[PDB]
Amino acid sequence: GLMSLDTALNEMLSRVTPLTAQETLPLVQCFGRILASDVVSPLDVPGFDNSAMDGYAVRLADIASGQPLPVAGKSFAGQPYHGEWPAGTCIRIMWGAPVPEGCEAVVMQEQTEQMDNGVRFTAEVRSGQNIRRRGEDISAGAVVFPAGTRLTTAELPVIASLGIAEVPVIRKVRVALFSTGDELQLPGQPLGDGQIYDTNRLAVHLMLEQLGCEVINLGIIRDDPHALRAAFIEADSQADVVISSGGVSVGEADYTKTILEELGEIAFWKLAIKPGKPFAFGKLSNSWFCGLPGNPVSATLTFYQLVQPLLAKLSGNTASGLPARQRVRTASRLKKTPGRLDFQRGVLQRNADGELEVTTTGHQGSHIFSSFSLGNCFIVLERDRGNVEVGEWVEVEPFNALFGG
Amino acid sequence: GLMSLDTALNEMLSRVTPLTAQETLPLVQCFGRILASDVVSPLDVPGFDNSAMDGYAVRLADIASGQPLPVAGKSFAGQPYHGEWPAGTCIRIMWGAPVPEGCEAVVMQEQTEQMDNGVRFTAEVRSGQNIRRRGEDISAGAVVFPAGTRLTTAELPVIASLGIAEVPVIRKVRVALFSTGDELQLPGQPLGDGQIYDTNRLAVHLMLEQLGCEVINLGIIRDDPHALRAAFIEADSQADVVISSGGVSVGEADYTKTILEELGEIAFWKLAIKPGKPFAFGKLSNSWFCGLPGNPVSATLTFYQLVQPLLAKLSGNTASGLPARQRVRTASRLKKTPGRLDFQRGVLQRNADGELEVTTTGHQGSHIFSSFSLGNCFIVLERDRGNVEVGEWVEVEPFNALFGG
């Protein structure tokens, strides 16, 4: 290969600056969006002393007495109790309801014996027991979620529980996309003479949209220097990132390479990876450019391992955009050639002991695309490693939602 | 406890009938959609026999001699070789190029040494070797993807490569959603007297949209028998599933329960799960009803483990809608009470040996929602299990995209 994935990745990310332009949106429209500013809680949580469960609000003296305590009233979720609450009585209280003024403890239903003249308290009652104190979870003025946090079902409902109806989020990353080659036809059109249906562009479009990006699909550009320069000029003026799905040079000498070098500072890398290897990256006037190789498997893997992380950083997200890996045993013999980090496709599954093991999807050649559908993970074989025998330990990276489940 | 998750799940799914209404859409709009009919390939892929690698095309004959055969021709990517093939030579050929008529085998250029007057073929040759036959990848008339398949980046580009521009997909499942309770306020509004901000509805809405459903959010219904009946009537008439985010009875006696029993055949279950337990399920006139408990953690877990799978079946998807589990060691002591299947929240991570282990998120009480954000998985503790000590084996279910994973 030559340059390592790690090097290229580090090179790309170190040059990129996260977006800062922001917009404020209602919570229901924030899924997947990146918080632009810290969320600081405006109130204490919980908001008022409340009951840990359904039972009775009591006072230590009354319990001590020993005689049953008549119910003087109740406290429900929607309506607290503002009655009088005289000595010798207890107050019926529901889970989550505000404890009444003067409440010194709450005992659960199960520890109370119903009596003829009030309720009996069987168990011992400790001071302050089962009373959720206001502010014991989140304190006002506190930072609940930091800027750069990707909003999900885990966070948005918490933000709503604080009374906040909208939050500022980084604007979506805008990505321009196009391919080129008179050999490319649009599905639905007839294939003529060694022609093929354009597929990489569809693949990148789908992935970009699932990643939450705004996509500007310029379609298939005709094989002409002027048409190509025009696409680049418009793409660069409307997006933060411009992606060539295939057709533009990733190293080979041709008119597209000349246009590339004239329009920006682009590097033509040769990565020590498989499948794939070539990749063009650099700065255009107002955007970043990522050039993908023509082979479908190669373009997909390159986009998935290189472009995806660049997009995560640009978005303002302070976390990685790729799944974590884990050590697993292979149930398949794997053909691997030293020299390249090989992202093979595999099938992660539980064996008899509920143990996780990986199997190969089959032929790992880049002449077919079916391994992405047949598998559910990448078997990331180390650069220097050679063939792998059944039973050996191997690193596995599960496919994220782009390839579904 | 009482009824097991498995029983309830089985009960729910066995009564549900997958949707069949369909619509035809361009590929770029099909991510996450369910194929309504099998996709049958209209053409061969590859359309002809081609070379499995760079090398030479030959026939046993010329190789049986054991003499060096001189290069008569060359077959390239889209540049085949046709005409005369001297009964004593071999043809140069490139990976993916069309083998010439009467070609018996392809030989990798590495097993041949150019002998300044011909080509010597080192290792013996096994007929048919390195020849990829037409229809080998996909044969016309063959089923490429079956109905019920969830379309993803793994499938759509394959469909496009066959020249198909659009495919029929099951229509989206329509889901009606609402909550009730004069205690509920809308974030942005002031909180008055034991009132709280509605949060479950936002949670369910977010999850429904990420699951690809069409959401009809009827907001907060006023605490009135007539308003409630009106919401149900309209929800049932527009959706396939109606969900109560909180406020409608899940067992407790009240006017909402009466309206429920009058509008449909609803069962009030008590599941042996934690958090949660209550759940209302049944048939309305033209839709299915799912009633969630008021506690945020309880509603979320119940929706995630019960409603999510029901939606997957209704959608026409022939696969499960929940992630698989795996056996892992705990690095935390876990408090667990026999009697309920406990879906605790945990943090899956790699240790020193690159080994995967789980840690608790902290307090597992349902009085806080932060465990969903702090964790990345559920530690599914068996119903009969008790406390768990560090080092014990435990089942773990990674959070899907609804929560960030």
From Swiss-Prot, chains A, B:
Pathway: Cofactor biosynthesis; molybdopterin biosynthesis. The keyword Lipid biosynthesis does not apply. Transmembrane segments: none annotated. Its cofactor is Mg(2+). Binds 1 Mg(2+) ion per subunit. One of its GO terms (molecular function) is identical protein binding. GO terms for biological process: Mo-molybdopterin cofactor biosynthetic process. One of its GO terms (cellular component) is cytosol. Its EC number is 2.10.1.1. Keywords: Magnesium, Metal-binding, Molybdenum, Molybdenum cofactor biosynthesis, Transferase. InterPro entries: MoaB/Mog-like_dom_sf, MoaB/Mog_dom, MoCF_biosynth_CS, MoeA-like, MoeA_C_domain_IV, MoeA_C_domain_IV_sf, MoeA_linker/N, MoeA_linker/N_sf. SUPFAM superfamilies: MoeA C-terminal domain-like, MoeA N-terminal region -like, Molybdenum cofactor biosynthesis proteins. It catalyses: adenylyl-molybdopterin + molybdate = Mo-molybdopterin + AMP + H(+). Catalyzes the insertion of molybdate into adenylated molybdopterin with the concomitant release of AMP. This is Molybdopterin molybdenumtransferase.
